[PDB]
Paper text:
Variants of the archaeal polymerase from Thermococcus gorgonarius, TgoT, that can either generate HNA from DNA (TgoT_6G12) or DNA from HNA (TgoT_RT521) have been previously identified.
TgoT_6G12 polymerase corresponds to TgoT variant with 14 supplementary mutations (V589A, E609K, I610M, K659Q, E664Q, Q665P, R668K, D669Q, K671H, K674R, T676R, A681S, L704P, and E730G). The final apo TgoT_6G12 and TgoT_RT521 structures contained flexible segments in the thumb subdomains. The high flexibility of these segments probably results from the absence of DNA or HNA inside the active site. On the contrary, larger rigid-body movements in the palm domains (r.m.s. deviation for Cα atoms: 2.7 Å for TgoT_RT521 and 2.3 Å for TgoT_6G12) were observed. However, very large rigid-body movements can be locally seen between the thumb subdomain of TgoT and those of TgoT_6G12 and TgoT_RT521.
Author numbering: 1 to 691, 698 to 755
Amino acid sequence: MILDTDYITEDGKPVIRIFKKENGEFKIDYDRNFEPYIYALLKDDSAIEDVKKITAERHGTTVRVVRAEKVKKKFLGRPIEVWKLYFTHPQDQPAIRDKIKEHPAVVDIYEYDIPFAKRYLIDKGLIPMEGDEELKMLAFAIATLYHEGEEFAEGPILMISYADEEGARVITWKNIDLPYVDVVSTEKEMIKRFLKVVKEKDPDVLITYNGDNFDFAYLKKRSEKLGVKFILGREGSEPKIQRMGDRFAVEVKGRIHFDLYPVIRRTINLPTYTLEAVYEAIFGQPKEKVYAEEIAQAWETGEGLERVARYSMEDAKVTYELGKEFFPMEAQLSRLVGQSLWDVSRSSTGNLVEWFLLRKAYERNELAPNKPDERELARRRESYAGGYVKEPERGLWENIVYLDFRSLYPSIIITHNVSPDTLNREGCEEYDVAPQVGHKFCKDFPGFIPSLLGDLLEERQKVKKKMKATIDPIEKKLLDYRQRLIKILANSFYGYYGYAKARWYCKECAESVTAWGRQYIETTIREIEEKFGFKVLYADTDGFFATIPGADAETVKKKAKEFLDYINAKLPGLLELEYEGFYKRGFFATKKKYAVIDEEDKITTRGLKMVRRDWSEIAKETQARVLEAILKHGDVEEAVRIVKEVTEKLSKYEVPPEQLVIYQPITKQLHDYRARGPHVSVAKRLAARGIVISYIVPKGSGRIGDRAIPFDEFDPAKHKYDAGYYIENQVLPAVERILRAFGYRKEDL
Ligand SMILES: [Ca+2]
Ligand SMILES: [Ca+2]
Ligand SMILES: [Ca+2]
Ligand SMILES: [Ca+2]
């Protein structure tokens, strides 16, 4: 299979290198016959002789046009004739493209900013990560000596850890009594030892967590300081560093540097992206953090080195575990888009669609529009109206069905042929008009994007049915990832339409999709109300919650299935409404805030879940008790009494102080925490003396931080906690947000 492609220069000529892994053997294929090129639209074919003679200069070397050929391609639906201009080297393109554009007889130029190695994969029809070849993976992490007022990598690397199927090991230059620790004499020997491990293991994938902006940069400065040839590449090369905007990225030639940090940054949404928080959210298992101060203190005193070595080991271990969880999904995404895993894993949603479209455009002989210039880019700060959100009929409801459209936005694009090449196209005999915005779309021929989107949805169905018949559980997982990734890519076409940097950007297309979406969701709602007598409790963009308040659970289900048969016969094209699920009870607080419970007793909450550690146990316990009384018992007046009971126990000081302790970690220098937080205030009082902050809020005057004390110093016989604080700032805010819709103000409890 193909891992990646790049180019080297030989006698001023580009040579493509294709890195492959066939039958467990690494191979490099060379191609010296791929010519870089750009298109040029001319107003007169006679002008081609003037364009051929246009010259530029890179660094003394004269840039010339190698050869030209007239080709017929499609552009905005219409057939067009452009000149394919070939060059000697891909770096000739940025040097001469401006001189060719400025020529009077040149209307415009196209496909002039496509990286050579990526242009090769598309033009040759090559797809990376294709097949069932097994890649060998290796994760690694480093521990460093940090001091407050020092430059980057001024301190040495203390430990280098690595992990794979054989387990996790730590290389260090100090004696540590642990079975997984390998001891060397110096930092130089530790680095050299790590090089030998990578060379002997010969992994296809190197997995890091933030290796793009820390690990490789630290290793580089250290190898320069110690005189070590950091040959990580399979061709004997040192890691290549690139600039990605305001940040960096690192390639390792012959292998795939898989940095988990940008991948997880897009996949899940978390408050922080530390390795500890990420691992705990994905695997649900805790991971202890050992700070730079503790590491430095342990290394200088030689005391708790086992704790440091164990932290180092866990870093490599969890990085390998996370890499095993996210890499197969990103590998299938790379195969789908048609680009290397290195680029795909570092590209955002907008670029992924663009690369997919660029490959398809070449296959369909479709000339790709250019990126917007700075002037046009500033003009594309255009916003528009989004999805429809119904104001919910607040309160507790019984026997609720959730109905939603199968791929609403892609269905609209296909059905109404929404595309920049069909937008206001004159000369057609059939059009579809978008409500409110009024944009017209030609229906005479399939548009470029709707046509590809139709093939994607069709391809996904071919994968779904092959999964049912696939005996092999590993192959079923592979197909499952591809199927899921097609759904993700198909649902990204809409956002791409409103993406200002997009080649196929079209605000008219984007707002037409949302306008049609608002129409279909609203028409379906009034249809179920008027012709089936349902009450629509709440709706958001592509689905709604409905019920018959005076009907049986089986009666609601039956009527819902009958409604589905009815509207699906009336919906045009690919639009389709589906039965998502049935819920025994449901509480709808405000727009975007609600909670439902199924027949199994599983509760789904969207809004103020409050599963955080920076909130007292008393507040979290009461909230759970309230939700249970509402969703399991359907007793609203019981949920109220529970809050009244808790506030009465808090006011009479009958609640144990252990369920009032708040735990908060110090992650930065005390001078940098100028938020006057209670945990920081407690920490500053500790630092004021000679020598996770666990504190309780006591009864007194001043700010919360002025009252707060560590729980170790709290004594029920000498001190009194702030009953008012735990009622008004902890319990009531957490519960009021749920009971709010009933009209139960804070003073009602
Ligand atoms: Ca590449
Ligand atoms: Ca659905
Ligand atoms: Ca088709
Ligand atoms: Ca239909």
